[PDB]
């Protein structure tokens, strides 16, 4: 999960060869879908991405406190000083064939947290097993291999 109510699950993992890459040989540690932005209106996710990218390229902690004077245009100006497209887009190539991609891609660092739910603690199956003393029906509990 990210710090703006955007959580999900890993659905597949790829190796560095099938990952789309930029002209500089950088590769995304993860890829999320853009169909999650509009209905949630989490513009703060995009602003955090932009500001974190600028801070990584520059090398100083970037303030993000509420009710302050930082604006989007200011950080975009500070971004263009370094040599990237101001709205955070970048040119990326396909990993399989090596061609160019028609549309540019929003790209940058963010902060993520690994939540407490693992699939290894939720997986359960049962063919047969112990019953109950009174009702003689399959017991309750995953750690007690119940139904």
């Amino acid at each position: 999960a990210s710090r703006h109510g955007q959580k999900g699950t890993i659905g597949i993992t790829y190796r560095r060869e099938d990952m789309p890459f930029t002209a500089e040989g950088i590769v995304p540690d993860l890829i999320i879908n853009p169909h999650a932005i509009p209905s949630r209106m989490t513009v703060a996710h995009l602003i955090e991405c932009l500001l974190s990218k600028v801070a990584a390229l520059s090398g100083n902690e970037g303030d993000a406190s509420p009710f302050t004077d930082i604006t989007v245009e200011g950080i975009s100006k500070l971004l263009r000083e370094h040599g990237y497209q101001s709205r955070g887009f970048e040119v990326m190539y396909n990993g399989h064939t090596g061609k160019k991609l028609m549309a540019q891609i929003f790209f940058g660092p963010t902060y993520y947290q690994r939540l407490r739910h693992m699939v290894d603690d939720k997986i359960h199956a049962r063919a047969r097993g112990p019953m109950q003393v009174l009702t003689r029906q399959p017991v309750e509990g995953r750690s007690r291999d119940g139904g």
């Binding site: 597949i12 790829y14 060869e17 099938d18 399989h96 064939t97 290894d120």
Partner: protein
């Protein structure tokens, strides 16, 4: 845990054929060739080379699921010409090109070392 072993990506199991050729029943002079333990690296190269032969009509490949290392290639050529022969010519041309590339790179690197 259900994570399969990684070495299944580059070691064939016993009783596995690296190639399997099957005639295609829809178009004349068409074959479907399954490669095992291989990915886009080889299929893209072979298809791009097979597209340069004026006697080759159709040449296309696919990787059905990104869990398994295998892919399918499909070839269709003109009458009086065998798709296996086309594959052999493509492989020969690729090998010659790679050899020339290696010789050129070695010459350039040695020249740079002399200039280093």
């Amino acid at each position: 845990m259900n994570a399969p072993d990684r070495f299944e990506l580059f070691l064939l199991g016993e009783g596995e054929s690296k190639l399997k050729i099957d005639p295609d029943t829809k178009a004349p002079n068409a074959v479907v060739i399954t490669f095992e333990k291989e990915d886009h690296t080889l299929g893209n190269l072979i298809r791009a080379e097979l597209l340069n032969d004026r006697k080759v009509l159709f040449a296309a490949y696919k990787v059905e699921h990104p869990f398994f290392a295998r892919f399918k290639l499909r070839i269709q050529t003109t009458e009086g010409y065998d798709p296996k022969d086309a594959l052999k010519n493509a492989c020969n041309s690729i090998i010659n090109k790679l050899g020339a590339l290696k010789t050129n790179f070695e010459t350039e690197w040695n020249l740079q070392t002399l200039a280093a």
